[PDB]
Structure formats: C-alpha cells, structure tokens
Amino acid sequence: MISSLWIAKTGLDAQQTNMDVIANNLANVSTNGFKRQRAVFEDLLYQTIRQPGAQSSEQTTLPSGLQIGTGVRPVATERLHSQGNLSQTNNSKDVAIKGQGFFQVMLPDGTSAYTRDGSFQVDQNGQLVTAGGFQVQPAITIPANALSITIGRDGVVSVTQQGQAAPVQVGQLNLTTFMNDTGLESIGENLYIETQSSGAPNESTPGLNGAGLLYQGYVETSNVNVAEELVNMIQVQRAYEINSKAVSTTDQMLQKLTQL
Amino acid sequence: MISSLWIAKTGLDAQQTNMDVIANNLANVSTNGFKRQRAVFEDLLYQTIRQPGAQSSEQTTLPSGLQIGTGVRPVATERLHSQGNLSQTNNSKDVAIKGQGFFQVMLPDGTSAYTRDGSFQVDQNGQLVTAGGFQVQPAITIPANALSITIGRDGVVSVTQQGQAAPVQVGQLNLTTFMNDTGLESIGENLYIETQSSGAPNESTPGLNGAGLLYQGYVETSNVNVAEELVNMIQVQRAYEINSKAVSTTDQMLQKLTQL
Amino acid sequence: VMLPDGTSAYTRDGSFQVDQNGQLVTAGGFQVQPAITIPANALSITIGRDGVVSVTQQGQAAPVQVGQLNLTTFMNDTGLESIGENLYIETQSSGAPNESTPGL
Amino acid sequence: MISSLWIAKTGLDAQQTNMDVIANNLANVSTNGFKRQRAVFEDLLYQTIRQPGAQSSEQTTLPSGLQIGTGVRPVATERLHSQGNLSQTNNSKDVAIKGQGFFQVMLPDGTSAYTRDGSFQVDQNGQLVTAGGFQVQPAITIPANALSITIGRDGVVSVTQQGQAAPVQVGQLNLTTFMNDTGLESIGENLYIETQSSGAPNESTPGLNGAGLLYQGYVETSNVNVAEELVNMIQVQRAYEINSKAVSTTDQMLQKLTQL
Amino acid sequence: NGAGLLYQGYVETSNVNVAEELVNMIQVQRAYEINSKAVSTTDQMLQKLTQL
Amino acid sequence: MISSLWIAKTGLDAQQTNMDVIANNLANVSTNGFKRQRAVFEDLLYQTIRQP
C-alpha cells in the first residue's frame, strides 16, 4: 500500500510485457513474411511536492523542485517493417514481393484485408487463393489443363497451355501500398486490416509509385534476428530480478516497521 | 501460466512439427514416386490492449496501438507435386508418367484411388496390378502366349503374339488430372483419394488436355534433396534450441518472483 | 454522477461498467451525467485523453463517436460533503461546480 | 478454517492430480497400444452475497453482484484415442491395427473385453491367445506342423503346410468398434470393457464400416509424446508452488491475527 | 455481427496473470497486519481505561 | 510416499528391466544358436474416482 510498492508493480508489469513481445518474436521465427515487434515504454506522472522554479523568496527561485515519479507504462508495440531475406523454393505458385506493398484479400464477410505472406495455391474452382481459403481481390482464375503458370516481374500472370503456342494473359495482379505501414492493425493468419492510423490504400501495379516487384519461386522469410533476442532476454531477466529485489526490500522495510 | 510460456510452447510445437516433416521427407528418399512435404506456419490472434488509430484527441490519433501476439499455428503441411527425375530399369511392366497426371486404381472395398508410382505386376489371373495387390481401373488383362508388351506414347497396351503374327490391342491406359492436386490427401502405399479440396477427376488419354506422356521401362523417383534437407535440419534445430531458452527464462523469472 | 434522487453527486474513483441498456454506469448502477451510450456488438471502446469516447465496429474502419465526457471542477473541493459509496455532494462551503472538457 | 485456506487446499489437490496423470502418462511410455490421458478442470460453486442484477432501487440495477468462488475440482480424464506410431519387428504373430476398432477377448470369468495392443502368442492347444493367456473371441486355432502362418490385409488368417501347396485358411480376425471409444472403462493389462457411455459394440471385417486394417509384423507403440511432458511438469510444479505460497500467506495472516 | 470465430484443436486457457497475484498477496498481508495492530491498539486503550 | 512417486518408481523399474534385456542381448551376439529376448509391458491397475 506504498508508493514504492506500486512503482515496483508497474516496473514488473512493464518487464513482463517486454518479455512477452520478445517471446512472440522468437516463436514465429520461421513464419514466411513475418515482421518483428518492439515495445516502447513511457513513464507515468510525477507528484510535485515543491514546484520547480518556485518563488522561494523575493528573488530566490528554486533551481529544481521536488518531484516523485509514479512508475512506467507501455505506450506502443511498434512493428519494424523491414525487408526479410528471400529464399529459393522452386514452386510455380510461390510469389515473394521485394520493396513495399501488400496483396489484397477478400474476407468471407465481404471486407478486404491486406497480407504479405505470398504462398498461393488453387482451390477446386480454379481461383487463386492463399493458405487459408481466402481468395485474392482481382479474382484470378486458373483454367484446367494448364501446364505452367508464369508471373513476370510485374503482375502479368500468364498460363502456358498445350495447344495455343503462346501464353494467355489471364489477368493482372496489383498490390496496395500505405504511407503508414507500421500503423496497420494486425489480425490472425498473417492478415492486416485498414484502420484510421493507416492511410487509404492506393492500389498500383508493381514497379510504379515506389511499389515492389514480384518474384516467382521465392518466399520472404520472417525478418527476425535471433542473435539479438538472446541478449534481450538476458537484459529482461536481470531487470525482472532487480525489480523483484526492490519489492522484497519494500516488504522487509514494512515488516520491520510493523513489528514494533 | 504466463503468456510468454504459452507462446514459447506453441513455438516449440511448431518447430517439432517442422522437424517431423523434415525427418519424414528425408527417411523415404529412395521411395519411387514420392513427393516431398512442406509445412507453412501462421501466427495466431493478437490481444489488442490499445486500439491502433485510437482517437486520443479531436485532432491527434495514435499511430500505432498496443498488440501482443498469441503465438503461431501450423496452418497446413502440404505435398509438393513437382516433377521428379526419371531412371531406367529395363522392365517391361514399368511405366513412368511425365508431366501432369495420375494412374487410377480400385481398392477392394470399391472406391478408387490415384497414384503416381508406376510399377505394375501381374496376378495369377493375368490382370494388371500395381505393387500392393491393387488392379488398375480399366482392368487390363494380359493373356497367355505373351512375348513382349508394348506401351506407346499414349495409353495403348499391345502384346506381341506368336500366333496370328499380329499385335492385338489389349486395352487402353487412361489417366486422370485434378485442377487442385495439392489438396489431395495422402494414405499409405503411394495412394491418393479425392477430397472436396480437389476438383472432380478429369480423366483422359496421354498427350491430351495437358496430361503427361507415358514412358516404357522408366520409373519416377522421389523429389527429395538431402542437400537442402540437411541445412533445413540445422535451421530447425537451432530454432528449437532458441525457443527452449524462452521457457527456461520464464521459469527462472517465476522462481525469482516466488522466492521473495 | 446522477443519483436516483435526481441530485448530481461528484466522484473521483473511475471504475465504470455497462448496464443492459448500453449506458455507462459506475459500480452501483448510478449513471454518468453526460449520458454516454455504447451500442451493441462493440469490438473495442477507447477513451482519449481529451475526453472523447469512441467505439470500433466490425466492417467499417472509421471509429464512431458515441459521446463526450466532460468533468467538473470546484473552487474549494475540501468543503464538498462526502456521502457514502464514494460520492461527494456540493455544499455552500464549496463554489458552484464548473463543467469543462478535460485538459482545458 | 478459512475460505481462502479451503480454496488453496482444493487447488493443491487439483495440481496433485494433474501431476499424477502426467507421471502415469510418462511411466508407460513403452507400452504397445497405449493412449495418453488429459484432465479437465471446472470451478466449484460460487457463494453469492449480493445477487447479480439486484434491484438496488426503483430504477438502479446492480451491473454485477458479489460472488466468492469455492475452488476447482477435476471433472474427467479424457483418453486421446489418436493413432500410435507403427514400429517394425519382423515377427509372424505380432499384428498391428491401423485405424479404429479393438480385438475382442474373453475374460476367464466369461465376460467379454476389448484391447488395442496386438502381440499374440500360442497356447499348448494351438489357440491364439494374447500376452496373458486370454484367447481371442473368434477362437482361432493353429494346427500342428505349421510351417508359417500369415495374416492378410483384411481379417483372413491362413497357414501353409508341408503336405499341401495352396495354403489352408483357418479363421477370421473380425474386429469390433464402438460409437464412442473415449467412454470405455479401462482396467489393467490394456483391456477395456463396455460401459453405458460407450455404445453397443459392432463387429466388422477390417477395412469396412470405417474400421482399420491389419499389418503383420508391426506393433502399435504408445502415442505418448515426451516433448511437452517436460513443460507440463514445469508448469504444474510452478502452480503447486503458487498454491503453497497462498497457504503460507493465509497462515501468516491468521497467526498475526491470533497473536494479539 | 461482431461475433467470435471458431478454431478447432485449441482450448482457451484461463486469463489469470500470476505476476500480479504475488504482489497483491503481499499488499493483502500487510494491510491485514496493520488492521490487526489497530485492533490491538484499541484493545490496549480500553484496557487502560477500564482499570481506572 | 505419494502416488506420483510410486508410479515413477514402477516406470524406473520397467526401464531398468528393458536396459538389462538390451545389454544381455548385446553381450552374446556371437553365440551360436542364440535367440534374442523381447520384454513386453502393460499398464497396471486403475483407481476410479468418478465411474465412467
């Protein structure tokens, strides 16, 4: 029931949130197209007993007042929208985007979400859907009897057929770019939905207006650096132990006070 | 216990599944007509403590909120129906299928399954049967006084007979195609059965509708590569060992918190 | 916070819940005076530092404003008479409460 | 004699039972045809001081009443009737069953029991008995001068003899399944008996009516995964520590009360 | 209509934060001890008064 | 003196018997006309709290 105890509780909770985000970053180290997160902490208010700059006398002004902090709180968990390393998989329907942008996906309830994990497949109706059953927005259809599917540098998906002697331009595969990519609200299954912090998307073809380029046969791995999470965990453990020590010291102080 | 512990447990489970699929791909490297497996991961939901784009004031809005992941989940582990290299066995009853297609066989209970591993024997009744005691759906029956069996580019099976000095068309060897070959489920002895994920089986003759050709005396080997399997094994081992560190750190933090 | 008797008491403890009709009430059933109402199927409700309250709904991106949360200031809060259940009522020893937006 | 103390005692008992089931799963990790168990927990009754939704005044209704929990009690231990990993031993009489269903045996007193572990032997008279002397229900008898006995994919069992050429069939290994296999009451030596929760057993040949298949020379190992048992033990130990700390705090406060 | 989704093969665990429970227990124990000391002080005061 | 301890003791004894069988089989690998051993286990009794 003491200010020191409450400050230490806030510190413990902040360290717990830091450890949680580190564990989440480590867990999906092998998730294609994953972007890591880091949490920023901002301290709480200050109780002022003696106001700084107080007019202590007719001329004397206090160089600094008496202020006591009230703890620390987590304010945001920002995503680091960096570029992950590309890999080789030698697959017809594995597309990795380089640069900036997002594929559009039509959710079952009629809304539109945005994704980054490009690993496509075909359903029983020929539609080009992602892993999870959600289909793309431009509604790309792959006819039967097809031999191979080629996606160029830009989104001109073409199908090599048996008796046409030339590929057929099935459709166009654009992507949407935001000006506040870190502001997107994330949901499960590697889908981002547009929010107010993120601006209105402006869909464009690859290679224009700063948009990225599509590559076939590549998969964008998670941009998680394992070599730094170990150091982060060590620092987190030390901070948690220190705060627990502070709590124990406060409790012992109170016990010695009340044993009289 | 704690969210960090649960996240690390989910990560451990995902890495264990990845290791298992790698081991299964590596074990049956020499199985003829084997398509390797690849597992795709996907992150779970997110707890939104602070909503992104929150309206803190009438003019200022939060650029990024507070979201904590709930771990990772294995969405699917699917088989890569790529093309495998061929080898010569100089066997009259061995056929290898090039391109896209599936032989059809009939299980004893009545249902029909689809295979890629072409290695046919003959039962005591003269009926064409694959390795495992399963007959081909067209039910080709090789008669007696058979000298040599010829299987051309298409599905024509003929036998050179000493009598009548003329080959006789024993039967036709059709094959089927699925517009979604990925969705086929897998059972033992190199069998696949139709599911709702895959379309209706479009049956045809070789060389038409995009179906692949047939080669006499060849066999389609597995599409596994030990060189990439080993490096993937190293990756998964390091990822699992890193994930275990999060569990250990959480346990130590809980112990220190308890020992106050 | 408005009592059943109709008098507007003033409280400091913030622990608010939502009753069946979607109104924002404190623990005890007493309702806040600006009469903040929360619609059904609300995903997340966020209260800004300025004083506004917004509700997020599935389907649309722009948050919908549901009400404004002003608060009162007294010239002498010591003279407020403390009735039970964490309520202070205005007396003659305290100046007339003035309502204002938070932070101003 | 305090509600907190009784709640903590119930929590300790629940954690003890969880540790017991974990240790039981770990102990018989090398038992053929064994299924893991998992406990399910529910909270006890809540004693209500003020009824939720109470009509506080003519208009005011309490948003949430005052309720105090009583604790947690275990409800059931579900057996995960998954598919065990198949091993190989190259034995004539070791038979594994893939899928569903159980072999039916007769207990000495006359009742009928069911088992999943297939590891058969032969008694003096030549009757096929399990490991323990119990004989299978169809009463399969192995004749003398038996060179080798074979069990096909279905339930047909034959044996070759020197004096003939075509093997002579002996019996049929029909297996029975249940509507709900989770509700089987288990007893020692891998035997399950029919109960009210489990439906009426229905017999069928292997490979029909959703039943499994018989593989000769294989034994179905237990489906116990040692990977997560360690983390379960860590979690249960920490939970026991937390509840013990709760008891300690209650004792400390009660002693400080009665000290005066 | 803002309803949840269904996932198969998973179970929703209890959302109990163990970290805060220990410090809450410490607070509860200290508050209980302080109130007990207040009761003892009142008892001592009454005992001194009664033997007047 | 607890159920988990007794279950773990039984498990340890089973593993020790399995190891002894393996060691004995490996010891005489060059013995003419020798047959390997194989130990089979089965779960012990069950104590019921709520009847299935």
**DSSP class per residue in chain B:** --HHHHHHHHHHHHHHHHHHHHHHHHHTTT-TT---EEEEEEE--EEEEE-TT--SSSS---SS-EEEE--EEEEEEEE---PPPEEE---TT-EEEESB-BEEEE-TTS-EEEE----EEE-TTSBEEETTTEEETT--B--SSEEEEEE-SSSEEEEEESGGGS-EEEEE--EEE-S--TT-EEETTTEEE--SSS---EEE-TTSTTBPEEEETEEE-----HHHHHHHHHHHHHHHHHHHHHHHHHHHHHHHHHT-
Nearest to D17, CA basis, from D35, D40, D1: D40
Task: List, in sequence order, every beta strand (DSSP E) within A9-122.
Answer: 37-43, 46-50, 66-69, 72-79, 86-88, 95-98, 103-106, 112-115, 120-122
Chains E and D touching, counted as 3 or more CB pairs less than 8 Å apart: yes
d(CA D37, CA D77): 6
Phi, psi dihedral angles at C87 (to 5 degrees)? -135, 135
Residues in chain A within 8 Å Cβ distance of B42: 31, 117, 131-132, 188-190
Cα–Cα distance, E7 to A245 (Å, whole number)? 41
Q: What does the alpha-carbon distance between residue A192 and residue B122 come to, in Å, rounded to a whole number? A: 57
For tokens 């000095």, what's the residue?
A: B165
Rounded distance between C-alpha atoms, residue D10 and residue D29, angstroms: 29
Query: Which one, of B104, B91, B216, lies nearest residue B152 by Cα?
Result: B216
Q: Which residues of A touch B81 (CB under 8 A)?
A: none
- The whole-angstrom distance between A200's CA and the closest CA on chain B is 13
Answer for the pair A103, A113: CB distance below 8 angstroms, yes or no.
Answer: no
**Separation between Cα atoms, residue D133 and residue D127, nearest integer Å:** 10
Task: Check if the beta carbon of residue D98 is closer than 8 Å to that of residue D83.
Answer: yes
Whether chain E has a CB inside 8 Å of the CB on B72: the answer is no
Looking at chain D, which runs of residues are DSSP E strands?
A: 37-43, 46-50, 66-69, 72-79, 86-88, 95-98, 103-106, 112-115, 121-122, 128-129, 148-151, 156-160, 168-172, 175-177, 185-187, 191-193, 202-204, 213-216, 218-220
Angstrom distance (rounded) from CA C42 to CA C34? 20
Both tokens assigned to A94:
């594995």
Q: What is the distance between the alpha carbons of residues D38 and D232, in angstroms, rounded to a whole number? A: 11
Q: Report the SS3 class of residue A150.
A: strand
Q: Which residue of D has its CA nearest to C18?
A: D63
Q: With the CA atoms of D57, D61, D63 and D66 taken in that order, what torsion angle do they form, in degrees rounded to the nearest 10? A: 60
Question: Method used for this model?
Answer: cryo-EM
CB-based contact B75 A189, cutoff 8 Å: yes
Q: Find the residue in A nearest to C64 (Cα).
A: A196
Taking a C-beta distance cutoff of 8 angstroms, is the pair B212, B176 a contact? Answer: no
Do A74 and B66 count as a contact with CB atoms less than 8 A apart?
Answer: yes
Distance CA F36, CA F29 (A): 9
- Which residue reads 């038996």 in tokens? D146
* Inter-chain CB proximity D26 and F10 less than 8 Å: no
The helix/strand/coil state of A168 is strand
Angle (nearest 5°) at CA A185 between A181 and A191: 90
Do residues B19 and B39 lie in contact, with contact meaning Cβ atoms separated by under 8 Å? no
Nearest residue to A150 (alpha-carbon basis) of A140, A142, A160, A135: A160
DSSP tag of C10: B
Give the max Cα distance, chain B. 99
CA proximity to C67, closest of C39, C30, C98: C39
The C-alpha R_g of chain A, in whole angstroms, comes to: 27
Interhelix angle for E18-50 vs A226-258, to 10°?
A: 10
Q: Is F30 on the interface with D (CB under 8 A)?
A: no
Q: Which of A203, A117, A201, A213 is nearest to A156 (CA)?
A: A213
Token pair recorded at residue C63:
């948050």
Nearest alpha carbon to residue A229 among B19, D235, B41, B7: B7
Instruction: Give the β-pairing of A191-193 and A185-187.
Output: antiparallel
D32 Cβ partners below 8 Å, 6+ apart? Answer: D117, D118, D119, D190, D219, D220, D221, D222, F40, F41
Closest of D191, D228, D180 to residue D81, by C-alpha: D180
- CB of C56 within 8 Å of a chain B CB? The answer is yes
- Candidates D243, D250, D241; CA nearest to D5 is D250
Contact B86, B220 (CB under 8 A): yes
CA–CA distance, D149 with A31 (Å, rounded to integer): 51
Rounded to 5 degrees, what angle do the CA atoms D196, D197, D198 make? 95
| Nearest-Cα residue of chain E relative to residue C58 | E2
Q: Which residue has the tokens 């089931």?
A: D21
Residues A92-127 as b or e (16 or more Cβ within 10 Å = b): bbbbbbbebbbbbbbeeeeeebbbbbbbbbbbeebb
For residue A188, what are the contacts with CB-CB under 8 A and spacing of at least 6?
B42, B43, B44, B45, B46, B70
**Does E52 reach chain B within 8 Å, measured CB to CB?**
no
E18 contacts in chain B (CB < 8 Å)? 1-2, 254
- C-alpha–C-alpha distance, residues B26 and B225, integer Å: 8
Q: Closest Cα partner for A223 from A40, A90, A31, A77?
A: A31
Identify residue D178 by its one-letter amino acid code. Answer: F
CA gap C35, C64 in Å, rounded: 16
User: What are the backbone dihedrals phi and psi of residue A245, each rounded to the nearest 5 degrees, phi first?
Assistant: -60, -40
Candidate from C58, C59, C61 with C-beta closest to A195? C61
Q: At what angle do helices E18-50 and D229-259 cross, to 10 degrees?
A: 10
Closest CA to A156 of A138, A168, A169, A146: A169
Q: List, as one string, the DSSP characters of D157-196.
A: EEEE-TT-SSPEEEEE--EEE-S-STTPEEETTTEEE--S
Type of residue found at D32: N
Q: B91-113 as b/e, with b when 16 or more CB fall inside 10 Å?
A: eebbbbbebbbbbbbebeeeeeb
D57–chain C Cβ distance below 8 A for any pair: yes
Nearest CA in chain D to E32: D253
Which residue in the set B68, B198, B238 is minimally distant from A21, CB to CB? B68
Return the structure tokens found at B87.
């080898």
Cα(D243)–Cα(C84) distance, integer angstroms? 36
Greatest C-alpha distance within chain A: 99
Q: What is the DSSP secondary structure assignment for residue A84, as one 8-state letter?
A: P
Residue of chain C whose Cα is closest to the Cα of A195:
C61
- Resolution of the coordinates, Å: 3.3
